[PDB]
Design a protein around this ligand. Structure first.
Ligand SMILES: CCCCCCCCCCCCCCC(=O)O[C@H](COC(=O)CCCCCCCCCCCC)COP(=O)(O)O
Ligand SMILES: CCCCCCCCCCCCCCC(=O)O[C@H](COC(=O)CCCCCCCCCCCC)COP(=O)(O)O
Lengths: 126, 62, 431, 44, 54
């Protein structure tokens, strides 16, 4: 519902401020560790809801070696959930592996859909 | 024979086509039907709805 | 750029271009396929191939000349081309072979060989050329029992009954001085042409042509030629349009430019500013389409043609196209009109300013025969620029909203619904 | 220029539709015009 | 001519007039039949009886 262009605009404003990045960034690190998706072997970009045309475009353009690895992490998380267990601690996702791999493909598809919408409902002047 | 030759349609064609008069009479008859069907459906619902108001023996003890 | 019309008994029109490297000289007659009857249909197409026959082309080729000919519904032309220093030889060839002697061309050995070659061309047209023969069938159903319905090539049934005496009877009625214009295009000056004609005393024949009695009239109809062994479906659809000398002639051409043409396999064709392309590309409803606005001396046709491999969704393709035509009466925007103005000026400028003097000779002679003069491209651009949105809405309320249509189709057309389902889409029951 | 495209509620198309919503909001206010008169009530 | 132009073309005014003409239709139809029905049965109604049982 909220676009990723809007999320990146608010988030990059905080990260450039030296006083706002001392307050919010320690709170965001505690929020992610309490969420617990890394103990099931998932990255955050695996959790994005995909039933919309922007996300279907970005998933088509992903390189195929990363698409095979994403499918294994989702399947392993479903099997761990039905057994009501967690993964062994040496199989958890580390923080330096929790990178936004899908975010540049999403932002490129959002900018192209915005430019098409502006050209389709447009004014002229002599 | 040749498919470019159109068969005879002359016993049903009008002597003058005059597109403003043929569309005007057909839309008069369709418009009169929607006029009478709406007035008929309205009185039908009001007959069923008014049967739930107070009966004649209830009003006599008012 | 200037045209010059002069009459001395013979109407002579020129269009001088001193940058061109060839010249072109011919004669255009003011009769076409709409001046024939259903029994001599194809007599104009036979006269073209007599002029382009092998012995006539060989006499021209030893001089350095080339020959062209064109048959339309309102006119026909016979054109000789040469280098700019030999326009006197090309005007001599038009005098000997076509005006004075015609018993050389109409010999029995030449007539039977030409009639065999024409019958093979018409047979291969009716079996293989599916977009152009659907458009020919659209003319015959929209103007049935009326001179504007006859095909320009003729039919196979009418061509085999033609003899030599049928061609001489057509030439005595139509190849006249009061029906003709002598044209000259390319690198040729106007006063050099009128002094070469006046150094002789050319005259075809004195008198006027016959007058037909039935005028053209549009009739809402359809014709279906179903063929399940063909791989596609081909459909044309039109309303009654504008004739030549109409005050709404340029407004009708701009309305067709709004919807335009499309090719699903060209990547730049998929990015055009046409709102109809949003519905079509979602489920791939067709392979190509094109919109047209044709004009004749008495009537015209406005509509589109299309070709499709998606044979189970034909009804969605017709429905989406006709709902966009409703917007020309109701809600056409100002940015769509400005886009169509620039593209109509580019299309008209490419038609009249190509580098082919044979194309210029056909366009110049056909316009002088009807109007008596020629409208310049500078004056046509100023009429296009003055069209407003209110001009478009007033034209479409008269010609498009709740009007009769004509349909033609061939191939796998089972999914094409019947007439009254398509006729009811010419209005919205919203406004 | 261009402005707020409203998603699909294009305003360039609102008052290209809405002058006949004085009669489209007036066709169902022409509707209860009919369907409310089996019992006495008056309202202008 | 243009009898179609507003009387049936504008279908905010058509569905509107399909509903508009049906409301004045109910009172003029009910007045005409009741007047015909009572004149056909004159001398038999209670109002024609009360006028001379008085
Ligand atoms: C289940 C089997 C069917 C049984 C018959 C049930 C009849 C109820 C359906 C109404 C039929 C007309 C549909 C109107 C329509 O949408 O056509 C509309 C056209 O409507 C108009 O333009 C004028 C309104 C037509 C008034 C017809 C009055 C009939 C009133 C019904 C009578 C009481 C039942 C679309 O049809 P089109 O595509 O041919 O244009
Ligand atoms: C569900 C009921 C359907 C009844 C089928 C028809 C059989 C005739 C019996 C009618 C009895 C009810 C009306 C009595 C009456 O007093 O009315 C009369 C006559 O008007 C009519 O109802 C005749 C029209 C019948 C319906 C026409 C199609 C309308 C579209 C379908 C309606 C469903 C929404 C009005 O007189 P009133 O206003 O003083 O009461």
């Amino acid at each position: 519902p909220q676009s990723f262009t809007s999320i990146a605009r608010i988030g990059d404003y905080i990260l450039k401020s030296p006083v706002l990045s001392k307050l919010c960034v320690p709170v965001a690190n505690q929020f992610i560790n309490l969420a617990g998706y890394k103990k099931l072997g998932l990255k955050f970009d695996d959790l994005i809801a995909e039933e919309n045309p922007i996300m279907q475009t970005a998933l088509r353009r992903l390189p195929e070696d990363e698409s095979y690895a994403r499918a294994y992490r989702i399947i392993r998380a479903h099997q761990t959930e039905l057994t009501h267990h967690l993964l062994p601690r040496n199989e958890w996702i580390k923080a330096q592996e929790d990178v936004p791999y899908l975010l540049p493909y999403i932002l490129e598809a959002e900018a192209a859909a915005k430019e098409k919408d502006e050209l389709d409902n447009i004014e002229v002047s002599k | 024979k040749s498919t470019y030759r159109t068969p005879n349609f002359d016993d049903v064609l009008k002597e003058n086509n005059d597109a403003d008069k043929g569309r005007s009479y057909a839309y008069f008859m369709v418009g009169a039907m929607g006029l009478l069907s709406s007035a008929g459906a309205k009185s039908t619902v009001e007959t069923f709805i008014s049967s739930m108001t107070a009966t004649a023996d209830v009003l006599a003890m008012a | 750029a200037e045209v010059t019309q002069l009459s001395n008994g013979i109407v002579v029109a020129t269009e001088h271009n001193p940058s061109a490297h060839t010249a072109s000289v011919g004669v255009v007659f003011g009769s076409g396929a709409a001046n024939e009857n259903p029994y001599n249909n194809g007599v104009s197409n036979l006269w073209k191939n007599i002029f382009l026959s092998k012995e006539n082309s060989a006499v021209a080729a030893k001089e350095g000349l080339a020959l062209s000919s064109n048959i339309s519904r309102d006119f026909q032309s016979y054109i000789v081309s040469s280098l700019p220093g030999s326009t006197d030889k090309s005007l001599d060839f038009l005098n000997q072979s076509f005006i004075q002697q015609k018993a050389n061309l109409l010999s029995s050995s030449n007539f039977e060989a030409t009639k065999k070659s024409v019958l093979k061309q018409v047979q291969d047209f009716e079996e293989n050329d599916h977009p152009n023969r659907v458009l020919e069938h659209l003319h015959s159903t929209a103007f049935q029992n009326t001179p504007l319905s006859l095909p320009t090539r003729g039919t196979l049934e009418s061509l085999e009954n033609l003899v030599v005496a049928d061609l001489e009877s057509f030439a005595n009625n139509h190849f006249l001085n009061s029906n003709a214009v002598v044209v000259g295009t390319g690198n040729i000056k106007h006063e050099d042409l009128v002094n070469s004609i006046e150094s002789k005393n050319l005259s075809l024949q004195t008198g006027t042509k016959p007058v037909l009695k039935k005028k053209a009239a549009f009739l809402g109809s359809e014709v279906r030629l179903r063929d399940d062994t063909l791989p596609k479906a081909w459909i044309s659809l039109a309303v009654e349009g504008e004739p030549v000398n109409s005050p709404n002639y340029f407004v009708a051409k701009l309305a067709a430019q709004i919807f335009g043409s499309y090719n699903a396999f060209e990547p730049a064709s998929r990015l055009q500013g046409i709102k109809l392309l949003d519905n079509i590309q979602e489920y791939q409803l067709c392979d190509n389409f094109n919109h047209f606005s044709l004009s004749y001396k008495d009537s015209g046709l406005w509509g589109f043609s299309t070709a499709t491999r998606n044979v189970t969704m034909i009804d969605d393709l017709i429905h989406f196209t006709l709902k966009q035509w409703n917007r020309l009466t109701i809600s056409v925007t100002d940015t769509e009109v400005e886009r169509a103005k620039s593209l109509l000026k580019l299309q008209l400028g490419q038609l009249y300013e190509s580098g082919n003097p044979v194309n210029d000779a056909n366009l110049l002679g056909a316009e002088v025969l009807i109007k008596g003069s020629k409208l310049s491209l500078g004056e046509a651009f100023k009429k296009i620029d003055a069209i407003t949105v209110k001009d478009v809405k007033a034209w479409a309320g008269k010609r498009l909203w709740d009007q009769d249509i004509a349909i033609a189709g061939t191939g796998q057309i089972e999914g094409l619904l019947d007439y009254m389902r398509i006729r009811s889409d010419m209005s919205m029951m919203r406004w | 220029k261009t402005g707020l495209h409203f998603g699909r509620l294009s305003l360039r198309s609102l008052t290209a539709y809405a002058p006949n919503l004085m009669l489209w909001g007036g066709a169902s206010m022409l509707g209860l015009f009919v369907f409310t008169e089996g019992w006495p009530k008056f309202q202008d | 001519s243009s009898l179609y132009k507003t009387f049936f073309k504008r279908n905010a005014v058509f569905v509107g007039t399909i509903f508009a003409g049906a409301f004045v239709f109910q009172t003029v139809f009910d007045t005409a039949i009741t007047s015909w029905y009572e004149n056909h049965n004159k001398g038999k109604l209670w109002k024609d009886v009360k006028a001379r049982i008085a």
